[PDB]
């Protein structure tokens, strides 16, 4: 369960994904998320009425080779966001920067 | 020469008329020098102005039937200031009345309600009670029912127009099509689902198969007897969203702070 939550970039996952992933019935999902929050492996909330489990904290983990590559990707995308924004704001309001 | 054109119209070959008009256009230079170009009228001058008008008139009418827009607009353009000038002395005719009706029907067919209302102001005094409303009545009525948005009345007027056709059919056939596009627009905002029958009834098709055909041309899929207006409308907005004009028209909240500051500091 923790592996899947780490690599997935979205911070909410439906219960159906966990049930098929883990080869456990859906009854057993509620036990497992509960056991996990108590151990403190993960923190979050359980919504039965959207059938989501919302993680809000993940415990540090080793960062495999493959994963080092992933970080670079997320940061490259965020470079472009900073950069495109800065351009507009450099251009507009040229009159005053003093 | 000048009379050969007048008799060519009555013959019924309106293509003969058209081939003969480049020669008679040369003679139209002469008629123009005879009249002082609308700067004082006398009894020499009323005949001269009269001949000029006859040649144009059978041309106006011939062009309309042969769907030759250009010629009609020009000929008519001339007729308009001539008739407008002066006090009555022969500056109105039965031909005037017919010609203005046909003209107004072209404007309804292009769906240019902007010019139609303006054109009516220019025309106004002449058609108040000195040609009255007799044939001119046909577009006046027509404007009224589509403003109210009773499409039922409008539609009925065009079909019943069969007994009024004299060359009116060149605008009347078109004006059916215009009705179909206006209604088509409306029915999207209302609902997403209409049965087959209902689509035909509002849009006034006489054939159910022709209905489904029109739906493809209108870029609507009808599936299992139900329209699915849902597709294209959404698609169009997504397509509109990519263009270039585009930042200030869309309006960015970021831009609001930047514009406010430079005002002050100027």
Tab-separated table of C-alpha atoms in Angstrom:
chain	number	residue	atom	x	y	z
A	1	UNK	CA	0.000	0.000	0.000
A	2	UNK	CA	2.790	2.459	0.831
A	3	UNK	CA	4.647	1.829	-2.410
A	4	UNK	CA	1.689	2.633	-4.486
A	5	UNK	CA	0.953	5.816	-2.490
A	6	UNK	CA	4.574	7.103	-2.970
A	7	UNK	CA	4.976	6.734	-6.644
A	8	UNK	CA	1.480	8.018	-7.537
A	9	UNK	CA	1.702	11.824	-7.808
A	10	UNK	CA	-1.966	12.351	-6.908
A	11	UNK	CA	-2.497	12.320	-3.110
A	12	UNK	CA	-5.824	10.432	-3.238
A	13	UNK	CA	-6.557	7.032	-4.362
A	14	UNK	CA	-9.767	5.194	-4.611
A	15	UNK	CA	-10.293	1.986	-2.340
A	16	UNK	CA	-10.884	-0.125	-5.498
A	17	UNK	CA	-7.333	0.273	-6.606
A	18	UNK	CA	-5.958	-0.936	-3.312
A	19	UNK	CA	-8.352	-3.922	-3.226
A	20	UNK	CA	-7.258	-5.360	-6.599
A	21	UNK	CA	-3.652	-4.374	-6.004
A	22	UNK	CA	-3.391	-6.208	-2.747
A	23	UNK	CA	-5.484	-9.284	-3.702
A	24	UNK	CA	-7.566	-8.682	-0.553
A	25	UNK	CA	-11.466	-8.230	-0.450
A	26	UNK	CA	-12.745	-4.670	0.179
A	27	UNK	CA	-13.590	-5.522	3.914
A	28	UNK	CA	-9.923	-5.907	4.587
A	29	UNK	CA	-9.039	-2.498	3.073
A	30	UNK	CA	-10.606	-0.720	6.014
A	31	UNK	CA	-8.624	-2.709	8.445
A	32	UNK	CA	-5.356	-2.066	6.669
A	33	UNK	CA	-5.647	1.711	6.314
A	34	UNK	CA	-6.647	1.866	10.000
A	35	UNK	CA	-3.669	-0.268	11.078
A	36	UNK	CA	-1.449	1.822	9.022
A	37	UNK	CA	-2.461	5.296	10.438
A	38	UNK	CA	-2.081	3.767	13.960
A	39	UNK	CA	1.472	2.511	13.220
A	40	UNK	CA	2.075	6.076	11.891
A	41	UNK	CA	3.399	4.750	8.576
A	42	UNK	CA	0.905	7.120	6.917
A	43	UNK	CA	-1.413	9.809	8.075
A	44	UNK	CA	-4.633	10.814	6.527
A	45	UNK	CA	-8.350	10.378	6.425
A	46	UNK	CA	-10.941	7.778	5.368
A	47	UNK	CA	-14.020	8.926	3.454
A	48	UNK	CA	-16.442	6.025	2.906
A	49	UNK	CA	-18.742	8.286	0.903
A	50	UNK	CA	-16.288	8.999	-1.849
A	51	UNK	CA	-14.559	5.772	-1.211
A	52	UNK	CA	-11.218	7.676	-0.991
A	53	UNK	CA	-8.287	7.483	1.347
A	54	UNK	CA	-6.444	10.833	1.417
A	55	UNK	CA	-2.805	10.647	2.468
A	56	UNK	CA	-1.206	13.731	3.871
A	57	UNK	CA	2.203	12.449	5.032
A	58	UNK	CA	4.548	9.800	3.707
A	59	UNK	CA	7.442	8.270	5.941
A	60	UNK	CA	10.932	8.726	4.351
A	61	UNK	CA	12.131	6.030	2.088
A	62	UNK	CA	15.209	4.920	0.208
A	63	UNK	CA	15.377	6.531	-3.178
A	64	UNK	CA	16.162	3.970	-5.709
A	65	UNK	CA	18.040	4.706	-8.945
A	66	UNK	CA	14.871	4.836	-11.060
A	67	UNK	CA	13.353	7.253	-8.551
A	68	UNK	CA	16.381	9.732	-8.778
A	69	UNK	CA	15.320	10.170	-12.391
A	70	UNK	CA	11.723	10.883	-11.415
A	71	UNK	CA	12.623	13.761	-9.116
A	72	UNK	CA	14.512	15.497	-11.928
A	73	UNK	CA	11.336	15.322	-14.077
A	74	UNK	CA	9.061	17.020	-11.496
A	75	UNK	CA	11.563	19.764	-11.015
A	76	UNK	CA	12.127	20.324	-14.752
A	77	UNK	CA	8.344	20.892	-15.070
A	78	UNK	CA	8.361	23.227	-12.123
A	79	UNK	CA	11.292	25.155	-13.642
A	80	UNK	CA	9.164	26.004	-16.618
A	81	UNK	CA	6.315	27.205	-14.417
A	82	UNK	CA	8.498	29.652	-12.520
A	83	UNK	CA	10.130	30.769	-15.693
A	84	UNK	CA	7.018	31.499	-17.793
A	85	UNK	CA	5.460	33.363	-14.989
A	86	UNK	CA	8.546	35.609	-14.484
A	87	UNK	CA	8.591	36.661	-18.026
A	88	UNK	CA	5.088	38.188	-18.040
A	89	UNK	CA	5.828	40.030	-14.901
A	90	UNK	CA	9.103	41.192	-16.109
A	91	UNK	CA	7.438	42.678	-19.162
A	92	UNK	CA	4.292	44.222	-17.631
A	93	UNK	CA	4.861	47.116	-15.226
A	94	UNK	CA	8.126	47.976	-16.923
A	95	UNK	CA	7.891	51.510	-15.816
A	96	UNK	CA	8.660	50.779	-12.202
A	97	UNK	CA	11.368	48.496	-10.832
A	98	UNK	CA	13.375	51.170	-9.078
B	1	UNK	CA	-32.403	50.176	-79.809
B	2	UNK	CA	-33.815	51.413	-76.382
B	3	UNK	CA	-37.117	49.706	-77.193
B	4	UNK	CA	-35.523	46.405	-78.211
B	5	UNK	CA	-34.623	45.836	-74.534
B	6	UNK	CA	-38.211	46.565	-73.286
B	7	UNK	CA	-39.651	44.004	-75.738
B	8	UNK	CA	-36.901	41.363	-74.926
B	9	UNK	CA	-38.200	41.142	-71.278
B	10	UNK	CA	-41.875	40.447	-72.343
B	11	UNK	CA	-40.663	37.721	-74.738
B	12	UNK	CA	-39.603	35.687	-71.690
B	13	UNK	CA	-36.033	35.060	-72.492
B	14	UNK	CA	-34.366	36.966	-69.667
B	15	UNK	CA	-30.914	35.788	-70.762
B	16	UNK	CA	-31.433	37.807	-74.056
B	17	UNK	CA	-31.987	40.855	-71.856
B	18	UNK	CA	-28.658	40.324	-70.076
B	19	UNK	CA	-26.586	39.965	-73.349
B	20	UNK	CA	-28.205	43.039	-74.749
B	21	UNK	CA	-27.486	45.201	-71.577
B	22	UNK	CA	-23.636	45.979	-72.357
B	23	UNK	CA	-24.611	47.862	-75.626
B	24	UNK	CA	-27.496	49.747	-73.907
B	25	UNK	CA	-25.123	50.793	-71.061
B	26	UNK	CA	-23.158	52.830	-73.628
B	27	UNK	CA	-26.522	54.682	-74.523
B	28	UNK	CA	-27.046	55.269	-70.782
B	29	UNK	CA	-24.235	57.942	-70.990
B	30	UNK	CA	-26.407	59.962	-73.318
B	31	UNK	CA	-29.513	59.868	-71.098
B	32	UNK	CA	-27.314	61.092	-68.307
B	33	UNK	CA	-26.175	64.203	-70.259
B	34	UNK	CA	-29.792	64.942	-71.195
B	35	UNK	CA	-30.819	65.262	-67.510
B	36	UNK	CA	-28.962	67.983	-65.416
B	37	UNK	CA	-28.406	65.293	-62.736
B	38	UNK	CA	-31.174	66.214	-60.361
B	39	UNK	CA	-30.561	69.941	-60.173
B	40	UNK	CA	-33.871	71.353	-61.519
B	41	UNK	CA	-36.806	69.586	-63.240
B	42	UNK	CA	-38.800	70.982	-66.193
B	43	UNK	CA	-40.840	69.393	-68.894
B	44	UNK	CA	-38.004	68.637	-71.216
B	45	UNK	CA	-36.281	66.997	-68.323
B	46	UNK	CA	-39.190	64.769	-67.081
B	47	UNK	CA	-39.165	62.693	-70.370
B	48	UNK	CA	-35.431	62.245	-70.250
B	49	UNK	CA	-35.436	60.991	-66.720
B	50	UNK	CA	-38.327	58.671	-67.642
B	51	UNK	CA	-36.439	56.729	-70.398
B	52	UNK	CA	-33.446	56.259	-68.120
B	53	UNK	CA	-35.719	54.555	-65.544
B	54	UNK	CA	-37.474	52.134	-68.111
B	55	UNK	CA	-34.199	50.514	-69.184
B	56	UNK	CA	-33.074	50.042	-65.597
B	57	UNK	CA	-36.501	48.612	-64.555
B	58	UNK	CA	-36.690	45.624	-66.840
B	59	UNK	CA	-33.043	45.019	-65.944
B	60	UNK	CA	-33.855	45.097	-62.181
B	61	UNK	CA	-36.478	42.391	-62.547
B	62	UNK	CA	-34.548	40.262	-65.062
B	63	UNK	CA	-31.542	40.056	-62.752
B	64	UNK	CA	-33.600	38.900	-59.796
B	65	UNK	CA	-35.092	35.929	-61.620
B	66	UNK	CA	-31.641	34.950	-62.930
B	67	UNK	CA	-30.251	35.227	-59.391
B	68	UNK	CA	-27.702	37.874	-60.486
B	69	UNK	CA	-27.439	39.950	-57.261
B	70	UNK	CA	-24.897	42.422	-58.548
B	71	UNK	CA	-26.967	43.904	-61.387
B	72	UNK	CA	-30.139	44.133	-59.256
B	73	UNK	CA	-28.381	46.130	-56.477
B	74	UNK	CA	-26.855	48.613	-58.934
B	75	UNK	CA	-29.932	49.171	-61.024
B	76	UNK	CA	-32.000	49.650	-57.906
B	77	UNK	CA	-29.280	52.018	-56.362
B	78	UNK	CA	-29.888	54.445	-59.288
B	79	UNK	CA	-33.726	54.064	-59.181
B	80	UNK	CA	-33.677	55.158	-55.453
B	81	UNK	CA	-32.435	58.835	-55.661
B	82	UNK	CA	-34.431	59.406	-58.906
B	83	UNK	CA	-37.758	58.414	-57.249
B	84	UNK	CA	-36.810	60.248	-54.081
B	85	UNK	CA	-36.396	63.530	-56.057
B	86	UNK	CA	-38.607	65.972	-55.956
B	87	UNK	CA	-42.400	66.502	-55.573
B	88	UNK	CA	-44.847	64.250	-57.355
B	89	UNK	CA	-44.957	64.633	-61.101
B	90	UNK	CA	-44.252	61.025	-62.013
B	91	UNK	CA	-41.660	59.731	-59.498
B	92	UNK	CA	-43.679	56.823	-58.145
B	93	UNK	CA	-45.113	53.877	-60.057
B	94	UNK	CA	-46.508	50.347	-59.568
B	95	UNK	CA	-42.982	49.232	-60.535
B	96	UNK	CA	-41.581	51.257	-57.613
B	97	UNK	CA	-43.712	49.466	-55.120
B	98	UNK	CA	-42.761	46.008	-56.369
B	99	UNK	CA	-39.109	46.858	-56.527
B	100	UNK	CA	-38.738	48.108	-52.953
B	101	UNK	CA	-40.641	44.964	-51.631
B	102	UNK	CA	-38.189	42.619	-53.406
B	103	UNK	CA	-35.323	44.723	-52.062
B	104	UNK	CA	-36.390	44.523	-48.449
B	105	UNK	CA	-36.907	40.660	-48.875
B	106	UNK	CA	-33.264	40.382	-49.988
B	107	UNK	CA	-32.176	42.119	-46.831
B	108	UNK	CA	-34.289	39.660	-44.599
B	109	UNK	CA	-32.697	36.797	-46.424
B	110	UNK	CA	-29.068	37.947	-45.780
B	111	UNK	CA	-30.357	38.409	-42.172
B	112	UNK	CA	-29.276	42.028	-41.979
B	113	UNK	CA	-31.950	43.524	-39.643
B	114	UNK	CA	-29.360	46.315	-39.052
B	115	UNK	CA	-29.701	47.881	-42.603
B	116	UNK	CA	-33.394	46.911	-42.942
B	117	UNK	CA	-34.583	49.196	-40.226
B	118	UNK	CA	-32.346	52.051	-41.482
B	119	UNK	CA	-33.554	51.548	-45.113
B	120	UNK	CA	-37.170	51.771	-43.886
B	121	UNK	CA	-36.388	55.262	-42.328
B	122	UNK	CA	-35.028	56.577	-45.724
B	123	UNK	CA	-38.076	55.121	-47.554
B	124	UNK	CA	-40.604	56.165	-44.936
B	125	UNK	CA	-42.661	59.102	-46.261
B	126	UNK	CA	-43.013	57.625	-49.766
B	127	UNK	CA	-44.495	54.288	-48.453
B	128	UNK	CA	-46.660	55.779	-45.651
B	129	UNK	CA	-49.755	56.287	-47.849
B	130	UNK	CA	-48.387	57.269	-51.335
B	131	UNK	CA	-47.658	53.555	-52.269
B	132	UNK	CA	-49.257	52.478	-48.946
B	133	UNK	CA	-48.822	48.974	-47.754
B	134	UNK	CA	-49.953	46.464	-50.349
B	135	UNK	CA	-46.961	44.506	-51.536
B	136	UNK	CA	-44.599	46.311	-49.232
B	137	UNK	CA	-46.699	44.664	-46.505
B	138	UNK	CA	-45.056	41.314	-47.081
B	139	UNK	CA	-41.681	42.046	-45.440
B	140	UNK	CA	-43.236	44.430	-42.756
B	141	UNK	CA	-45.439	41.543	-41.477
B	142	UNK	CA	-42.469	39.159	-41.770
B	143	UNK	CA	-40.152	41.276	-39.543
B	144	UNK	CA	-42.959	41.514	-36.881
B	145	UNK	CA	-43.512	37.748	-36.253
B	146	UNK	CA	-39.825	36.767	-35.977
B	147	UNK	CA	-39.132	39.695	-33.461
B	148	UNK	CA	-41.968	38.254	-31.343
B	149	UNK	CA	-40.332	34.899	-32.060
B	150	UNK	CA	-43.434	33.184	-33.181
B	151	UNK	CA	-41.842	31.046	-35.837
B	152	UNK	CA	-45.270	29.315	-36.381
B	153	UNK	CA	-46.734	32.537	-37.807
B	154	UNK	CA	-43.628	33.295	-39.866
B	155	UNK	CA	-43.442	29.969	-41.453
B	156	UNK	CA	-47.122	29.936	-42.392
B	157	UNK	CA	-46.656	33.342	-44.223
B	158	UNK	CA	-43.955	31.995	-46.622
B	159	UNK	CA	-46.051	28.907	-47.770
B	160	UNK	CA	-49.186	30.985	-48.185
B	161	UNK	CA	-46.870	33.347	-50.183
B	162	UNK	CA	-47.414	30.962	-53.087
B	163	UNK	CA	-50.486	32.936	-54.177
B	164	UNK	CA	-48.344	36.227	-54.019
B	165	UNK	CA	-45.296	34.930	-55.934
B	166	UNK	CA	-44.594	37.147	-58.981
B	167	UNK	CA	-40.767	36.888	-58.578
B	168	UNK	CA	-40.887	36.961	-54.835
B	169	UNK	CA	-39.715	33.225	-54.845
B	170	UNK	CA	-36.045	34.338	-55.073
B	171	UNK	CA	-36.166	35.514	-51.513
B	172	UNK	CA	-38.948	33.311	-50.130
B	173	UNK	CA	-37.134	29.954	-50.731
B	174	UNK	CA	-34.070	31.295	-48.890
B	175	UNK	CA	-36.081	32.741	-46.033
B	176	UNK	CA	-37.213	29.113	-45.093
B	177	UNK	CA	-33.546	28.144	-44.586
B	178	UNK	CA	-32.919	31.208	-42.464
B	179	UNK	CA	-35.788	30.126	-40.134
B	180	UNK	CA	-34.123	26.688	-39.734
B	181	UNK	CA	-30.816	28.036	-38.539
B	182	UNK	CA	-32.449	30.511	-36.003
B	183	UNK	CA	-34.536	27.731	-34.339
B	184	UNK	CA	-31.657	25.268	-34.395
B	185	UNK	CA	-29.655	27.599	-32.199
B	186	UNK	CA	-32.418	28.010	-29.651
B	187	UNK	CA	-33.240	24.436	-29.016
B	188	UNK	CA	-29.670	23.604	-27.793
B	189	UNK	CA	-29.796	25.996	-24.846
B	190	UNK	CA	-33.207	24.478	-23.779
B	191	UNK	CA	-32.538	20.829	-23.816
B	192	UNK	CA	-30.227	18.056	-24.990
B	193	UNK	CA	-32.840	15.448	-25.979
B	194	UNK	CA	-35.662	15.726	-28.547
B	195	UNK	CA	-37.338	12.793	-30.293
B	196	UNK	CA	-37.218	12.481	-34.148
B	197	UNK	CA	-40.741	13.794	-34.596
B	198	UNK	CA	-40.140	16.885	-32.537
B	199	UNK	CA	-36.967	17.927	-34.418
B	200	UNK	CA	-38.989	17.733	-37.693
B	201	UNK	CA	-41.936	19.655	-36.362
B	202	UNK	CA	-40.013	22.745	-34.972
B	203	UNK	CA	-37.707	23.032	-37.965
B	204	UNK	CA	-40.675	22.429	-40.360
B	205	UNK	CA	-39.195	19.521	-42.531
B	206	UNK	CA	-41.820	17.562	-44.489
B	207	UNK	CA	-39.778	14.346	-44.559
B	208	UNK	CA	-38.405	12.476	-41.505
B	209	UNK	CA	-35.362	11.163	-43.440
B	210	UNK	CA	-34.568	14.715	-44.616
B	211	UNK	CA	-34.635	15.571	-40.876
B	212	UNK	CA	-31.727	13.183	-40.059
B	213	UNK	CA	-29.853	14.294	-43.094
B	214	UNK	CA	-30.107	17.956	-41.908
B	215	UNK	CA	-28.938	16.876	-38.472
B	216	UNK	CA	-25.578	15.604	-39.969
B	217	UNK	CA	-25.186	18.895	-41.898
B	218	UNK	CA	-25.911	20.791	-38.699
B	219	UNK	CA	-23.199	18.677	-37.100
B	220	UNK	CA	-25.628	16.937	-34.713
B	221	UNK	CA	-25.718	13.138	-34.335
B	222	UNK	CA	-29.306	11.656	-34.023
B	223	UNK	CA	-28.981	8.233	-32.476
B	224	UNK	CA	-31.853	5.816	-31.790
B	225	UNK	CA	-34.321	8.630	-32.244
B	226	UNK	CA	-32.644	11.188	-29.917
B	227	UNK	CA	-30.404	14.165	-30.575
B	228	UNK	CA	-27.237	14.492	-28.724
B	229	UNK	CA	-26.612	18.199	-28.840
B	230	UNK	CA	-24.062	17.468	-26.154
B	231	UNK	CA	-20.980	16.861	-28.443
B	232	UNK	CA	-20.407	19.703	-30.792
B	233	UNK	CA	-21.395	22.591	-28.535
B	234	UNK	CA	-18.654	21.715	-25.889
B	235	UNK	CA	-16.207	20.956	-28.737
B	236	UNK	CA	-16.665	24.487	-30.264
B	237	UNK	CA	-15.959	26.271	-26.947
B	238	UNK	CA	-12.786	24.245	-26.403
B	239	UNK	CA	-11.756	25.126	-30.025
B	240	UNK	CA	-12.673	28.906	-29.512
B	241	UNK	CA	-10.447	28.838	-26.342
B	242	UNK	CA	-7.316	28.542	-28.670
B	243	UNK	CA	-6.851	31.673	-30.644
B	244	UNK	CA	-4.654	34.815	-30.438
B	245	UNK	CA	-6.140	38.286	-29.298
B	246	UNK	CA	-6.311	36.711	-26.302
B	247	UNK	CA	-4.852	37.656	-22.917
B	248	UNK	CA	-6.717	41.007	-22.338
B	249	UNK	CA	-9.990	39.730	-23.790
B	250	UNK	CA	-9.925	36.663	-21.421
B	251	UNK	CA	-8.793	39.071	-18.583
B	252	UNK	CA	-6.103	37.811	-16.074
B	253	UNK	CA	-6.247	38.737	-12.404
B	254	UNK	CA	-2.354	39.058	-12.548
B	255	UNK	CA	-2.737	41.718	-15.215
B	256	UNK	CA	-5.070	43.747	-12.941
B	257	UNK	CA	-2.348	44.458	-10.396
B	258	UNK	CA	0.276	45.298	-13.092
B	259	UNK	CA	-2.049	47.772	-14.980
B	260	UNK	CA	-3.167	49.453	-11.628
B	261	UNK	CA	0.444	50.278	-10.549
B	262	UNK	CA	1.816	51.926	-13.724
B	263	UNK	CA	-1.221	54.373	-13.658
B	264	UNK	CA	-0.211	55.744	-10.303
B	265	UNK	CA	3.494	55.973	-10.986
B	266	UNK	CA	3.006	57.734	-14.342
